[PDB]
Each structure stands twice: as structure tokens, then as C-alpha cells.
Symmetry: C2
């Protein structure tokens, strides 16, 4: 059962994170895509979001030439929650060539509570690529699973 991989040895991961992955299980089968920029974004929870078997959890597609860039891989997942929100992070994306000390890309998704939908309104917020390190692409989406 291939899915999101958390830090730590298999079967010895944080119970907090494991519980959140369980809570989001109903979203695994879904696919989320941005609406509208020269790029489109596709996001999935613990499942391949790309079309190149790269293990992507979130990909960026350049519309003009179809280039698919891996923003983050689900084999490097972090997930935590607050009152009415859940933050999901996928590290290990394709490396930058000139920005951010050439570190691997990363996806940060802020899922906010919304009692009216199981999941929707996924869209990019911005890309932070102006730092020497710890850069990231930020996204937001709504989900009733984030309510609590």
C-alpha cells in the first residue's frame, strides 16, 4: 500500500502525523488542479500527481510546452494541524538550477476548514524562490476534513 512516507523508520512514525494521513484517506482517490499565468498545478494527497512516474505529490505544468516539473514528492511528507486547518508539505521536488542554492523544490499546502465541501478551491498562492535556502511553492485549498 504505497502512500505518503513520513520521517522515521516505517512503522515508527509520529502518531500525530499518521492520524492525519488516516483522516485524509478519503481524498487519496481525488485530483486537484489550479484554476485561471504560464503554469498550471496538479495536486494529490499521497498519490502520483504527475504523468511521468516520478513520485510527485504536486506538479507544475508549463502550459506553452507541457513541461512537468515536480514541486514535491509524497515520499517526503510532513503533515500537522491546528484548530481549523491542516498544513501538508511535500519536500524532494526537482532541484532549482539557479535559485535557492539549487535546493530541491518543496510544496506547502494550507488546507482550511470549509463545512460545504469535502475538498475544493485548490490554487497556488505564490512561489518563494528569492531566498538562499528554505524556498517553497505555497498553495491553499478548502476541506471539511480540516474542520475541528
Amino acid at each position: 500500500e504505497k502512500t505518503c512516507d513520513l520521517v522515521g523508520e516505517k512503522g515508527k512514525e509520529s502518531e500525530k502525523e499518521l492520524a492525519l494521513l488516516k483522516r485524509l484517506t478519503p481524498l487519496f482517490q481525488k485530483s486537484f488542479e489550479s484554476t485561471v499565468d504560464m503554469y498550471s498545478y496538479v495536486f494529490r494527497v499521497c498519490r502520483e500527481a504527475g504523468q511521468h512516474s516520478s513520485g510527485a505529490g504536486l506538479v507544475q505544468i508549463q502550459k506553452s510546452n507541457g513541461k512537468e516539473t515536480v514541486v514535491g514528492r509524497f515520499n517526503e511528507t510532513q503533515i500537522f494541524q491546528g484548530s481549523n486547518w491542516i498544513m501538508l508539505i511535500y519536500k524532494g521536488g526537482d532541484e532549482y538550477d539557479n535559485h535557492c542554492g539549487r535546493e530541491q523544490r518543496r510544496a506547502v499546502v494550507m488546507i482550511s476548514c470549509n463545512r460545504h465541501t469535502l475538498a475544493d478551491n485548490f490554487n497556488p498562492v505564490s512561489e518563494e524562490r528569492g531566498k538562499v535556502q528554505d524556498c517553497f511553492y505555497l498553495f491553499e485549498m478548502d476541506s471539511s476534513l480540516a474542520c475541528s
Copy 2:
């Protein structure tokens, strides 16, 4: 004069973070506190934005005070600040806290503060949410607070 330090040498800091830093200025003069837990683990968490929250000039941005003896533990230092915002929230992270002795591979503590929009106050409801010390890395103390500055 000492304030939050962002990653990167002077002139190499993120334009986004620099702008956000300036936006947070009205919060610098404030101080926040919240007591939670039960002895012998009752703590008093003191948080400040880009200013010393501790009583030992350690550059702490957020401290955990052991109520049983008043001992101060640094959760995060503001010279290791990261800040970013979304549509109706702002997340502040202070790394460089005191090292754990038995958890998280002894990495330095870290404070993560989720600031949610509230048009009724400049800042209120500072609340400790939880502590994640069960991972091999990337552990952290999580807090929440309200602020009109997080409103778009």
C-alpha cells in the same frame, strides 16, 4: 535595535519576508503569555515578535517557563526567523531553541506560530496548541494567535 533575522546575508533576504517583517512592526512592542499543562509539567509560554521574550538576554523569541521552579527553556530564537503569509493567515517560525536531551535526535527546539485573521484585534488569543517531539527530525511546538494584520 535587535530584531528578527531572516535567512541570507544582508541584501540577500527574501523581498517577501522583508515586506512581511515591516508589516508586523506594530506587534514588536507587544508580549503574549499563556499557561497550560499540569504539574510537574505546567508551563508558562511567553511569546514576542522580533523581540526578547526571555529574562536572560538569550535572544529568545518564545520561551517555556517551568512553573515549578521558574526555569526558562528557549523554544525559539528570533535571529532564526522565517515568516510567510496566505490569504487570511501568517505563519511565523523561530528555530534555534534549546536542544532536546532525549528527543528528536537532540535537535534545537522550534516554535511555529499560526496567526489567523481577526478584524477585531491587533493581537489576542495566544494559545499553545501542541508539541511534536515524537519524530527523528523536524519537531516543533505549535501555537496559534489572532491578528488583524493577517487579514487581506
